[PDB]
Amino acid sequence: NNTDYPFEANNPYMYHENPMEEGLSMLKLANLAEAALAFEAVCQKEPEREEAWRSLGLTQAENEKDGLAIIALNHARMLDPKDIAVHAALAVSHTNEHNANAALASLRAWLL
Protein backbone atom coordinates (compact mmCIF):
# COMPACT_ATOMS: atom_id res chain seq x y z
CA ASN A 1 0.00 0.00 0.00
CA ASN A 2 0.52 3.65 0.77
CA THR A 3 3.75 4.86 2.38
CA ASP A 4 2.54 8.45 2.87
CA TYR A 5 2.34 8.81 6.62
CA PRO A 6 0.16 11.50 8.25
CA PHE A 7 2.61 13.00 10.72
CA GLU A 8 1.17 14.72 13.78
CA ALA A 9 1.90 18.44 13.63
CA ASN A 10 3.46 20.20 16.61
CA ASN A 11 5.47 17.13 17.70
CA PRO A 12 7.61 18.16 20.68
CA TYR A 13 10.29 15.64 19.81
CA MET A 14 11.10 17.61 16.62
CA TYR A 15 13.42 19.82 18.69
CA HIS A 16 15.01 17.00 20.74
CA GLU A 17 18.50 15.73 19.91
CA ASN A 18 17.97 11.98 20.06
CA PRO A 19 14.29 11.13 19.66
CA MET A 20 15.21 7.57 18.49
CA GLU A 21 16.76 6.82 21.88
CA GLU A 22 13.87 8.43 23.75
CA GLY A 23 11.43 6.46 21.60
CA LEU A 24 13.16 3.16 22.44
CA SER A 25 13.22 4.02 26.14
CA MET A 26 9.53 4.96 26.22
CA LEU A 27 8.51 1.94 24.16
CA LYS A 28 10.34 -0.36 26.57
CA LEU A 29 8.40 1.35 29.43
CA ALA A 30 5.05 0.98 27.62
CA ASN A 31 4.52 4.73 27.12
CA LEU A 32 3.27 4.15 23.61
CA ALA A 33 1.76 7.46 22.48
CA GLU A 34 4.96 9.26 23.46
CA ALA A 35 7.14 6.60 21.85
CA ALA A 36 5.11 6.90 18.62
CA LEU A 37 5.65 10.67 18.59
CA ALA A 38 9.38 10.25 19.16
CA PHE A 39 9.62 7.80 16.26
CA GLU A 40 7.53 10.08 14.01
CA ALA A 41 10.15 12.78 14.71
CA VAL A 42 12.97 10.43 13.70
CA CYS A 43 11.10 9.54 10.48
CA GLN A 44 10.81 13.24 9.56
CA LYS A 45 14.41 14.10 10.54
CA GLU A 46 15.97 11.01 8.94
CA PRO A 47 13.46 9.76 6.34
CA GLU A 48 15.68 6.92 5.09
CA ARG A 49 16.22 5.37 8.53
CA GLU A 50 14.39 2.09 8.08
CA GLU A 51 14.61 1.16 11.79
CA ALA A 52 12.73 4.38 12.69
CA TRP A 53 9.87 3.49 10.31
CA ARG A 54 9.78 -0.11 11.60
CA SER A 55 9.77 1.09 15.25
CA LEU A 56 7.00 3.62 14.49
CA GLY A 57 4.96 0.87 12.84
CA LEU A 58 5.46 -1.64 15.70
CA THR A 59 4.63 1.05 18.29
CA GLN A 60 1.45 2.03 16.42
CA ALA A 61 0.39 -1.66 16.26
CA GLU A 62 1.03 -1.99 20.01
CA ASN A 63 -1.02 1.20 20.56
CA GLU A 64 -3.95 -0.31 18.62
CA LYS A 65 -3.56 1.91 15.58
CA ASP A 66 -3.05 -0.73 12.93
CA GLY A 67 -3.99 1.57 10.02
CA LEU A 68 -1.15 3.93 10.91
CA ALA A 69 1.08 0.93 11.67
CA ILE A 70 0.56 -0.41 8.13
CA ILE A 71 1.53 2.90 6.47
CA ALA A 72 4.75 3.08 8.50
CA LEU A 73 5.54 -0.59 7.95
CA ASN A 74 4.96 -0.19 4.18
CA HIS A 75 7.48 2.68 4.29
CA ALA A 76 9.96 0.48 6.16
CA ARG A 77 9.51 -2.30 3.57
CA MET A 78 10.25 0.16 0.72
CA LEU A 79 13.50 1.13 2.48
CA ASP A 80 14.59 -2.43 3.29
CA PRO A 81 12.64 -4.98 1.26
CA LYS A 82 14.54 -7.84 2.94
CA ASP A 83 13.48 -7.07 6.51
CA ILE A 84 11.28 -10.07 7.28
CA ALA A 85 10.22 -8.77 10.72
CA VAL A 86 8.44 -5.97 8.78
CA HIS A 87 6.83 -8.59 6.50
CA ALA A 88 5.42 -10.46 9.48
CA ALA A 89 4.32 -7.25 11.19
CA LEU A 90 2.40 -6.14 8.10
CA ALA A 91 0.48 -9.44 8.02
CA VAL A 92 -0.25 -9.14 11.77
CA SER A 93 -1.54 -5.56 11.55
CA HIS A 94 -3.78 -6.34 8.54
CA THR A 95 -5.30 -9.23 10.51
CA ASN A 96 -5.61 -7.08 13.66
CA GLU A 97 -7.41 -4.32 11.75
CA HIS A 98 -9.79 -6.80 10.09
CA ASN A 99 -10.62 -8.51 13.39
CA ALA A 100 -11.21 -5.19 15.26
CA ASN A 101 -13.46 -3.90 12.48
CA ALA A 102 -15.46 -7.17 12.48
CA ALA A 103 -15.86 -6.94 16.29
CA LEU A 104 -17.12 -3.37 16.02
CA ALA A 105 -19.53 -4.24 13.19
CA SER A 106 -20.91 -7.15 15.31
CA LEU A 107 -21.39 -4.92 18.36
CA ARG A 108 -23.06 -2.13 16.34
CA ALA A 109 -25.40 -4.72 14.82
CA TRP A 110 -26.40 -5.81 18.33
CA LEU A 111 -26.73 -2.29 19.80
CA LEU A 112 -28.39 -0.36 16.96
Ligand SMILES: [Mg+2]
Ligand atom coordinates in the same frame (compact mmCIF):
# COMPACT_ATOMS: atom_id res chain seq x y z
MG1 LIG B 1 -4.17 -4.59 19.06
